[PDB]
Design a binder for these strands. Sequence first.
RNA 1: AAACUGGGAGACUUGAGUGCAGAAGAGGAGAGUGGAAUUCCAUGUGUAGCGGUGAAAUGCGUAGAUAUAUGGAGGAACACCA
Length: 117
Amino acid sequence: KKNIESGVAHIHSTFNNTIVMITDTHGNALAWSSAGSLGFKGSKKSTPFAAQMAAEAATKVAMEHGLKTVDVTVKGPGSGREAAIRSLQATGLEVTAIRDVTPVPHNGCRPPKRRRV
RNA sequence: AAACUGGGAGACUUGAGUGCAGAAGAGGAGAGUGGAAUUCCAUGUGUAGCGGUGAAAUGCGUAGAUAUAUGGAGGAACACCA
């Protein structure tokens, strides 16, 4: 439907999870996934393999509506950010841009206590 | 008695200040202003999780969360320079 054939992948990868949503060239979302929505639990949600299969479960649906063009904007200073890409290309999509979008404050707000573990 | 310390009348320019000619600086007080980010709000797309740990649970979520796009509101601190 809508035979968009263009869009941009958003990767949001923290220390203990990983989300990949694929939306079109502007806003409105088409298909998403995350490691939790694949039965994984707890620790394992941060290994790259989780990002592998989540990228797959998103692509497989995004190209069930016609899609080649995609870019990659990676938030999320975590680990599996590149495994997400390697699964994004090698199951059909047409990656052509990588960019980093990490919020960097110019010293505005105060962060929480340091943990004494 | 008259070297030294004290007192009295003077004299001097090296200490101390003044004039003239220049230099650097997150020194202080007042009044405006900028962008990055966090929170909340409004609206579109959007399906079942998100968040968190050494592992879990409490918490938020099908009164449509998280994500994602555009617009507003307020406060505090000023990345690189260093």
